[PDB]
Amino acid sequence: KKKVIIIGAGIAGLKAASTLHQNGIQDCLVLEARDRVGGRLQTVTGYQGRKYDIGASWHHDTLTNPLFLEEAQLSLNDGRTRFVFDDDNFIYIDEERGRVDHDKELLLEIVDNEMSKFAELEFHSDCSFFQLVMKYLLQRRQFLTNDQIRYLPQLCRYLELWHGLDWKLLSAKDTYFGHQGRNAFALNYDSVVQRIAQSFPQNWLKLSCEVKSITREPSKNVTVNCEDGTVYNADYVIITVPQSVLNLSVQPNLRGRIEFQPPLKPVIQDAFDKIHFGALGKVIFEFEECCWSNESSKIVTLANSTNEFVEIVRNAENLDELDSMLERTSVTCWSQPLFFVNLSKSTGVASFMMLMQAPLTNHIESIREDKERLFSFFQPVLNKIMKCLDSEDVIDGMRPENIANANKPVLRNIIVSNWTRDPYSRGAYSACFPVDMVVAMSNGQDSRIRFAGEHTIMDGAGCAYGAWESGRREATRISDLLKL
Amino acid sequence: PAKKKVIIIGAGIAGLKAASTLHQNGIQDCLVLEARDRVGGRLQTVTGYQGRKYDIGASWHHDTLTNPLFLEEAQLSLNDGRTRFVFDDDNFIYIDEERGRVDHDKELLLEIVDNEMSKFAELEFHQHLGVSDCSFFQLVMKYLLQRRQFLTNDQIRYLPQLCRYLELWHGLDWKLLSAKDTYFGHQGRNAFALNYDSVVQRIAQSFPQNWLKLSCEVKSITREPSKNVTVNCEDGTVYNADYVIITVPQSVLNLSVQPEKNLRGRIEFQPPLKPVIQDAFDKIHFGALGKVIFEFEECCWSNESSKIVTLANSTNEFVEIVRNAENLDELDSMLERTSVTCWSQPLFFVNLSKSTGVASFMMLMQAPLTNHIESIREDKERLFSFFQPVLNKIMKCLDSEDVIDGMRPANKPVLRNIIVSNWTRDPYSRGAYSACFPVDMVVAMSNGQDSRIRFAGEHTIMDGAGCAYGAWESGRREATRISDLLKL
Ligand SMILES: Cc1cc2nc3c(=O)[nH]c(=O)nc-3n(C[C@H](O)[C@H](O)[C@H](O)COP(=O)(O)OP(=O)(O)OC[C@H]3O[C@@H](n4cnc5c(N)ncnc54)[C@H](O)[C@@H]3O)c2cc1C
Ligand SMILES: Cc1cc2nc3c(=O)[nH]c(=O)nc-3n(C[C@H](O)[C@H](O)[C@H](O)COP(=O)(O)OP(=O)(O)OC[C@H]3O[C@@H](n4cnc5c(N)ncnc54)[C@H](O)[C@@H]3O)c2cc1C
Numbered sequence: 001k002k003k004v005i006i007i008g009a010g011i012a013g014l015k016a017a018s019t020l021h022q023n024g025i026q027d028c029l030v031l032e033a034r035d036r037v038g039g040r041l042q043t044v045t046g047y048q049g050r051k052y053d054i055g056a057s058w059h060h061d062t063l064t065n066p067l068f069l070e071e072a073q074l075s076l077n078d079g080r081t082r083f084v085f086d087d088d089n090f091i092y093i094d095e096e097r098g099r100v101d102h103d104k105e106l107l108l109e110i111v112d113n114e115m116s117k118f119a120e121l122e123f124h125s126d127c128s129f130f131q132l133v134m135k136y137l138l139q140r141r142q143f144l145t146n147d148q149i150r151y152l153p154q155l156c157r158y159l160e161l162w163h164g165l166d167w168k169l170l171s172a173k174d175t176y177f178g179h180q181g182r183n184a185f186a187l188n189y190d191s192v193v194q195r196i197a198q199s200f201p202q203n204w205l206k207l208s209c210e211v212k213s214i215t216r217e218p219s220k221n222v223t224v225n226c227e228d229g230t231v232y233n234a235d236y237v238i239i240t241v242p243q244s245v246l247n248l249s250v251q252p253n254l255r256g257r258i259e260f261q262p263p264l265k266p267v268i269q270d271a272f273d274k275i276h277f278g279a280l281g282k283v284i285f286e287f288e289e290c291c292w293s294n295e296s297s298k299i300v301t302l303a304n305s306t307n308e309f310v311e312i313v314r315n316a317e318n319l320d321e322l323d324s325m326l327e328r329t330s331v332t333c334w335s336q337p338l339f340f341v342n343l344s345k346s347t348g349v350a351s352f353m354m355l356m357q358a359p360l361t362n363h364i365e366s367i368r369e370d371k372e373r374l375f376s377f378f379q380p381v382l383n384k385i386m387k388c389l390d391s392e393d394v395i396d397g398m399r400p401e402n403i404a405n406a407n408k409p410v411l412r413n414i415i416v417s418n419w420t421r422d423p424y425s426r427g428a429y430s431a432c433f434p435v436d437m438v439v440a441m442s443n444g445q446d447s448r449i450r451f452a453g454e455h456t457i458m459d460g461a462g463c464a465y466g467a468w469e470s471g472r473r474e475a476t477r478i479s480d481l482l483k484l
Numbered sequence: 485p486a487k488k489k490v491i492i493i494g495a496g497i498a499g500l501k502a503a504s505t506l507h508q509n510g511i512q513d514c515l516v517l518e519a520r521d522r523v524g525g526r527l528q529t530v531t532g533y534q535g536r537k538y539d540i541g542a543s544w545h546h547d548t549l550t551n552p553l554f555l556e557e558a559q560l561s562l563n564d565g566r567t568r569f570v571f572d573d574d575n576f577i578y579i580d581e582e583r584g585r586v587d588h589d590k591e592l593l594l595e596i597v598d599n600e601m602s603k604f605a606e607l608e609f610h611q612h613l614g615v616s617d618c619s620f621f622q623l624v625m626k627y628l629l630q631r632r633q634f635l636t637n638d639q640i641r642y643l644p645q646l647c648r649y650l651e652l653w654h655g656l657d658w659k660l661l662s663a664k665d666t667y668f669g670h671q672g673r674n675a676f677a678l679n680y681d682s683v684v685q686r687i688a689q690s691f692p693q694n695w696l697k698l699s700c701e702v703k704s705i706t707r708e709p710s711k712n713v714t715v716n717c718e719d720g721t722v723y724n725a726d727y728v729i730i731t732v733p734q735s736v737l738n739l740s741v742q743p744e745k746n747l748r749g750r751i752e753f754q755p756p757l758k759p760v761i762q763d764a765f766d767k768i769h770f771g772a773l774g775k776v777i778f779e780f781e782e783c784c785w786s787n788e789s790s791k792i793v794t795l796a797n798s799t800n801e802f803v804e805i806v807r808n809a810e811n812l813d814e815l816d817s818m819l820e821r822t823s824v825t826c827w828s829q830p831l832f833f834v835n836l837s838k839s840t841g842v843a844s845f846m847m848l849m850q851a852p853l854t855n856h857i858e859s860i861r862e863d864k865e866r867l868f869s870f871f872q873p874v875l876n877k878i879m880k881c882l883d884s885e886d887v888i889d890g891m892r893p894a895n896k897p898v899l900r901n902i903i904v905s906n907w908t909r910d911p912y913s914r915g916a917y918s919a920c921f922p923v924d925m926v927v928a929m930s931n932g933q934d935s936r937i938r939f940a941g942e943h944t945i946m947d948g949a950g951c952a953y954g955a956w957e958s959g960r961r962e963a964t965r966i967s968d969l970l971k972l
Contacts, residue, residue, distance in 0.1 A: 063604060076633060085634055087596050089588055102575055102588055104788055110573050114672050117549060121671065142562060143548070143571055143673070167643070180607065181600045181632070295590055345590075 008240035010039020015471030023198035063181030164280025171432035278431030281361030496525020528534030549672030618754030655773030706753035748911035771919030
């Protein structure tokens with residue numbers, strides 16, 4: 001009854017629809033499991049109507065990012081502000097010393113560069129970003145001070161926030177990856193979603209439709225059917241659900257899962273072994289008003305470091321001696337690095353958007369509803385930030401004020417992501433464990449069972465534009481064929 | 485016609501290493517013919533005010549992550565605790581004449597757009613179709629053009645000047661620099677050699693002294709097809725040798741491909757340098773990086789960093805031109821618009837105080853400034869008058885008052901001396917090092933004139949090209965080959 005059925009209203013799915021329609025193509029559908037489009041792009045509303053992208057929030061590689069360029073043109077055309085360039089000089093904070101960024105004697109960023117060049121060279125078998133950092137420290141200790149060896153490895157972990165994976169879980173071979181230029185903070189990714197979503201017939205979209213199985217009818221027909229009984233049949237099928245969800249079509253009923261008939265060709269099934277997903281998480285701390293210095297919009301808190309980490313480095317005879325000397329509990333805000341976006345400086349909002357990673361993410365998302373517990377967990381670093389930003393310890397104003405505020409940051413609310421605990425996202429996005437999936441998805445189960453999504457592309461992989469393009473790809477293809 | 489196994493022309497790090505190697509391989513009867521009354525070549529350490537020393541040629545070990553010469557030095561230090569170098573990379577302080585310091589600025593964010601600029605340049609040439617190079621200047625203009633919608637007015641004004649620190653990497657004004665060659669990847673931090681001479685002497689001392697013959701200016705190399713090479717010093721002597729490793733500067737070697745034999749440093753080749761070598765000169769040129777040392781009594785200024793760069797003057801007018809231009813064509817035209825001052829180009833200052841304790845400044849300059857300044861390296865009064873404005877400004881931004889002319893004998897800076905390089909006017913260097921204007925040479929060089937007439941030096945190798953360690957490798961390269969040959 002339909003031409004092509006798009007599964008998923010994320011930006012990939014939306015783009016595909018947007019394209020088809022842009023090609024006159026008619027009679028198509030977008031089946032979304034949730035009661036909203038946007039997929040991993042969701043803007044939520046907090047205190048006083050402040051808006052926040054709980055999922056994606058940046059246009060990466062603005063130099064080449066084609067989705068960003070389109071937004072840029074729209075803005076050049078109507079003057080509407082769609083994004084702001086928020087890259088800033090990062091501020092790094094260690095519980096003990098405090099600020100360790102742009103340091104006269106620590107010069108951490110410079111060694112971090114060397115560390116980077118080292119990794120480029122090292123490759124050009126693959127270990128963990130952690131192991132790699134350790135190899136470097138060992139291999140260059142002769143040229144590193146005691147303080148550099150202490151904090152450098154901590155500071156360099158900000159990369160855990162780019163992947164949303166701790167350094168012992170992260171692939172070093174994929175850890176470093178130069179970005180094609182500055183980043184632009186989307187002042188409404190929801191505008192992008194809304195703009196694309198309303199660029200095709202609104203009657204194509206069918207929300208709360210969890211597709212349970214895709215059956216191939218050799219007779220040049222495809223049987224799609226949401227688990228609510230309703231069955232559809234279209235010429236072509238573009239599957240845009242997350243890799244983590246798709247990755248369920250190979251296990252022995254779980255929600256979101258799509259039963260493929262016939263099974264997914266092996267090449268694809270193998271890929272799920274050579275590619276994993278990450279768990280980047282977000283916590284929004286909403287303050288009554290800014291009462292801290294807006295020196296920068298990017299702040300990173302370093303996990304605790306031990307002056308006895310040095311002695312071990314200063315001793316190991318090799319990666320085996322060091323490897324063992326290392327294996328020689330409790331999880332707090334200081335157990336890992338935490339990336340804080342000070343929205344006050346870059347968007348004029350008295351809030352902090354903090355990014356977290358696996359394994360911490362999953363745990364904090366677990367207690368998303370426990371505000372007193374959440375505040376208690378982040379209070380230390382929150383206060384450590386305010387001090388460094390010439391302010392006072394945070395007051396808890398989440399419940400009906402204090403009067404003793406005025407000069408003290410008054411927390412009014414906290415918003416936590418829920419991607420790990422959401423059955424339709426089961427994670428943040430494609431991430432590397434210490435590749436081929438791109439091809440497996442690009443080719444497609446067949447001439448009519450295509451794949452799209454941030455995990456189905458090489459350029460922009462794991463990104464909004466990467467997904468946006470993959471949606472136009474598989475689309476523009478099915479656009480010409482049908483056109484016939 | 486004294487018989488020799490290998491005759492090395494030039495006692496710079498290239499030939500020194502060649503000889504050295506040659507020795508280690510047990511080769512005997514070799515000569516190192518050097519024109520100056522010294523060894524080292526573009527590696528020279530001069531003395532100044534109160535015994536202070538400075539390397540007026542090379543000063544750094546670049547790419548310390550893979551620099552064989554560097555590693556070799558670090559090793560010797562791992563075995564005796566001797567300080568030979570000092571990793572002096574710091575956070576650059578940028579000073580505009582007007583707006584004072586512009587580095588690490590939360591609103592200007594210069595270093596961030598520099599980063600984007602670097603990536604833009606990489607993205608422009610990594611996709612190498614029939615690319616077509618252009619000047620660095622022209623590249624930055626294209627960047628500003630394409631990205632004007634994402635730059636504030638102050639960034640468009642200062643960025644183009646800040647990114648010009650690169651001129652002091654090549655020794656060339658951005659209008660004369662090949663964009664295609666501008667951004668190279670410095671593999672690792674740099675180690676400020678604490679006496680490059682110690683590297684030179686160590687290597688020199690690594691072979692028979694009697695092999696070294698200073699003040700002998702080789703005027704010609706003749707290839708007797710009879711399986712031999714004849715070499716002639718100007719001192720009249722005439723040596724004969726199985727192999728010759730010419731390590732003279734590209735600039736000096738270039739003198740051979742032109743009629744006029746009586747040029748200081750010019751070697752006469754017979755047979756003349758093959759066509760592939762002559763023609764290779766049309767494909768690369770020499771840069772003019774220069775050094776000026778500002779020595780003061782003591783240090784009455786901040787030591788926040790050891791890297792300070794002074795940006796050239798910019799104008800808000802320039803910003804308006806970028807905003808209104810339509811393309812690269814109109815931009816240049818609209819750019820069509822007196823006299824050189826210490827603010828007509830960026831200048832790079834190495835604040836030796838912080839990194840070495842010495843109350844002195846090591847300042848680098850490019851072409852054409854380098855030539856003009858070296859031309860008047862004697863007029864100390866004029867030099868001070870030239871660099872007074874930036875000298876002050878630096879001191880200002882560094883918390884201090886204006887400079888005091890104390891050259892001809894507590895909180896006020898007092899300049900005692902000023903040392904200037906002389907590479908352009910030196911007949912045996914005629915420049916600084918190989919540099920690109922908007923590979924043929926390396927190939928033609930490393931493949932030699934023939935089995936016997938070979939070439940070494942910073943201009944004869946790819947890895948570390950133009951670097952002290954590259955020249956050094958080229959030495960070990962040729963020496964090894966011959967060694968093998970002599971072994972058989
Ligand atoms: C915390 C976080 C921060 C991020 N930050 C950035 C950033 O700064 N920049 C950037 O570029 N990217 C960022 N991303 C990634 C970006 O969000 C994704 O790359 C992009 O949204 C993926 O798009 P998609 O269209 O493939 O899938 P959408 O999630 O992304 O998912 C596909 C759609 O399929 C639906 N679906 C699943 N199962 C079924 C089913 N059985 N039936 C019907 N529908 C189904 C889903 O509900 C969903 O709507 C971030 C992600 C997270 C989690
Ligand atoms: C101002 C300046 C700063 C620099 N800074 C750095 C730096 O920080 N780091 C770095 O790695 N590199 C630096 N370099 C480059 C480095 O100095 C050179 O790459 C290297 O010294 C070249 O060595 P060479 O042995 O090839 O040649 P030299 O240029 O060393 O040549 C060898 C010798 O040939 C002799 N000679 C010439 N003609 C004749 C003749 N006719 N007969 C006999 N002998 C002759 C010369 O007098 C010379 O001593 C710098 C160069 C300059 C000019």
